[PDB]
Amino acid sequence: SAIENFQPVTADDLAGKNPANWPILRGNYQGWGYSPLDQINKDNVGDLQLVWSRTMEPGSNEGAAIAYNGVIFLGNTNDVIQAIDGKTGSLIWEYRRKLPSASKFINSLGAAKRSIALFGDKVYFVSWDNFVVALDAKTGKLAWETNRGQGVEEGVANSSGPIVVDGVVIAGSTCQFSGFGCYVTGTDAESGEELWRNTFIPRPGEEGDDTWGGAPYENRWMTGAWGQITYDPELDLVYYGSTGAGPASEVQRGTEGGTLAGTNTRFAVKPKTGEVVWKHQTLPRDNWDSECTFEMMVVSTSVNPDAKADGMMSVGANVPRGETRKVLTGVPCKTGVAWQFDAKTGDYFWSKATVEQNSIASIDDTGLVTVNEDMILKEPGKTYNYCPTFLGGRDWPSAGYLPKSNLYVIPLSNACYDVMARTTEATPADVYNTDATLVLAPGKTNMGRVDAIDLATGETKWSYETRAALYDPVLTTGGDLVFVGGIDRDFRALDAESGKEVWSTRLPGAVSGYTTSYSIDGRQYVAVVSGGSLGGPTFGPTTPDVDSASGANGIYVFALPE
């Protein structure tokens, strides 16, 4: 019944023009993570009840209920993709990919799936074995698939999911365990043909090669773009970020003093060709697995950064003070530093630290980052007391935007990392080749944190804290609410004006996935993916007083009583 009248998904849908739907990971191309739906608000959220839920596949459950005209399209782990009736929770269809033995995959991160994408009459995803796959939206049956190469034993995969722009399926990659770097590809949405492929590691003698400290090309590992892809329709620019290089220690990399051009860089590209329009490196010389690959939002804001605002690193030399600009803005890296650029040109406006961090010594008025020499891993076996951690700070769990108050709302972890490079020689399988102990940041007794930052001034308007890590995306809504899960297993709503908790329910496991909102027949639903991820096992032991069990992977859907 729900799938019967399926109407093709357009750019207008993906631009978030219909608030009854959530047809893309962050609700719109621009990455807002916002639902304009306002039925559920501060005055009635206390009445929210569980309407329906459904078991999801085991593993790291970081997915998102992609909602479209009464149907939920849901990427589970293990390349299981489902369509579910958004009103009843009844399964409509299920695709289950035939997988080689899990042991054959050197990159287990490809098993988790933050999103599927929609366009036309198809559901698009990247499989664990690194195929761009198109399913029929109406049936879940495979329409086409294209092998990108180097999957499985060779470890190239994807965890965040693609987006489709102008008939082009755009998808990044993780090559976390590989002795090489990876890429972002653009694939024709109809034919399945690969149209372009952007890589990051400079080839010998090419632009930026001289910033790799003389490291042989074949020793340059793991540079990818595994985070979330965003897009601005008006500028026609696709935005993504690349990551660092492994192992973490530049001494073990053989890249001493190397700023590593291509790594941790924010790219703005044309969707049909991958042509780079502008780029900015937000974390050079990375020794801290900083991964500047997370979603960056496109918003229109007045530009008036306060140089005295807490954490403000610098203000751009040519900042158009008092003027309204379309900006690319947010926290791109685990470090927790918020950035703001002109979205069209890439001109640097400002940057501001959130959590305690000590990897960045300074950022000048052009946006040039200078790293902290004290934190470069120069002596293997020596403990370096890095802030934040290889899980942040921030990590993949996405921020949300509140257009009414111009607030950027970001989930964060108050953690630091006593990190040491191993004394043994690094192989690709060793990843960062470090051993670490995670601790609370100095003077912090609350691990979980959400900052709400005014995008005009860079001032933090409020900060919500809780004992255990959140490590879960936020949803912002027109009802003036912020929804967020945590490893404490609470799925909570915060007052968007104050950051104070106004409602919560406790789910059976750590609330580990995305929260989305949609409506059917005038009724607003709030859907959260839960069960657990790397967050609980990593942050849980720091606050053992909190019951942060993982389990009962599932989608859980709430609404006001009828």
Binding site per annotation, positions for Zn(2+): 13, 176, 232, 234, 280, 289, 291, 306, 326, 459, 490, 501, 504
Identify which of residues 420 and 453 has a Cβ nearer to Zn ion in the complex. 453
DSSP H/E element including 280? strand 276-281
* Binder among 48, 84, 106, 109 for ligand PQQ (CB under 6 A): 109
* Segment contacting Cl ion by CB under 5 A, of 16-24, 186-194, 273-281, 361-369: 16-24
Contacted by 267, from Cl ion, Zn ion, ligand PQQ, none: CB < 5 to 8 Å by type: none
DSSP β-ladder status, 183-188 and 434-440: unpaired
Length of the chain: 562
- Distance separating alpha carbons of residues 359 and 357, to the nearest angstrom: 6
- Binding of ligand PQQ at residue 472 (CB under 6 A)? no
Considering the complex, what minimum distance in angstroms separates the CB of residue 96 from Zn ion?
28
Q: Which of residues 290-349 bind ligand PQQ (CB under 6 A)?
A: 291
* Segment contacting Cl ion by CB under 5 A, of 13-21, 175-183, 260-268, 366-374: 13-21
State the binding string over 162-181 for ligand PQQ (x if CB under 6 A, else -): ------------xxx-----
Identify which of residues 13 and 356 has a Cβ nearer to Zn ion in the complex. 13
- Distance separating alpha carbons of residues 184 and 279, to the nearest angstrom: 15
* Segment contacting ligand PQQ by CB under 6 A, of 6-14, 63-71, 248-256, 389-397: 389-397
Identify which of residues 194 and 306 has a Cβ nearer to Zn ion in the complex. 306
Considering the complex, what minimum distance in angstroms separates the CB of residue 133 from Cl ion?
24
Residues of the shown chain interacting with Zn ion in the complex, contacts defined by CB under 5 A: 13, 232, 234, 280, 306, 459, 504
Identify which of residues 146 and 359 has a Cβ nearer to Zn ion in the complex. 359
Q: How far is CA 399 from CA 178, 220, 323, 482, in A?
A: 29, 31, 24, 10
Count of CB atoms situated within 10 Å of the CB of 207: 10
Residue showing tokens 């004992």: 467
DSSP3 helix / strand / coil % (the chain, rounded to 5): 5, 40, 55
- Binding of ligand PQQ at residue 289 (CB under 6 A)? yes
- 456, 302 Cβ separation under 8 angstroms: yes
Closest residue to Cl ion in the complex (CB): 18
Question: Which pair of tokens denotes residue 53?
Answer: 């839920």
DSSP β-ladder status, 523-530 and 434-440: unpaired
Closest C-alpha to 517, from 40, 137, 159: 40
- Distance separating alpha carbons of residues 100 and 444, to the nearest angstrom: 45
- 233, 15 Cβ separation under 8 angstroms: yes
Which letter does DSSP use for residue 104 in this model?
A: G
Q: Which of residues 205-224 bind Cl ion (CB under 5 A)?
A: none
Identify which of residues 63 and 499 has a Cβ nearer to ligand PQQ in the complex. 63
State the binding string over 17-36 for Cl ion (x if CB under 5 A, else -): -x------------------
Considering the complex, what minimum distance in angstroms separates the CB of residue 527 from Cl ion?
17
Closest C-alpha to 457, from 543, 349, 297: 349
Burial label for 425, CB within 10 Å (0-12, 13-18, 19+), is exposed
- Binding of ligand PQQ at residue 534 (CB under 6 A)? yes
Closest C-alpha to 287, from 231, 229, 343, 369: 369
Q: Which of residues 221-280 bind ligand PQQ (CB under 6 A)?
A: 222, 224, 226, 243
- Binding of ligand PQQ at residue 77 (CB under 6 A)? no
- Known binding residues are 13, 114, 159, 174, 176, 226, 232, 234, 280, 289, 291, 306, 326, 334, 395-396, 459, 471, 490, 501, 504
**Taking the alpha carbons of 337, 342, 345, 348 in that order, is the dihedral positive or negative?**
negative
Considering the complex, what minimum distance in angstroms separates the CB of residue 17 from ligand PQQ?
30
- 258, 279 Cβ separation under 8 angstroms: no
Q: Which residues bind ligand PQQ (CB under 6 A)?
A: 60, 62, 109, 112, 159, 174-176, 222, 224, 226, 243, 289, 291, 390-391, 395-396, 533-534
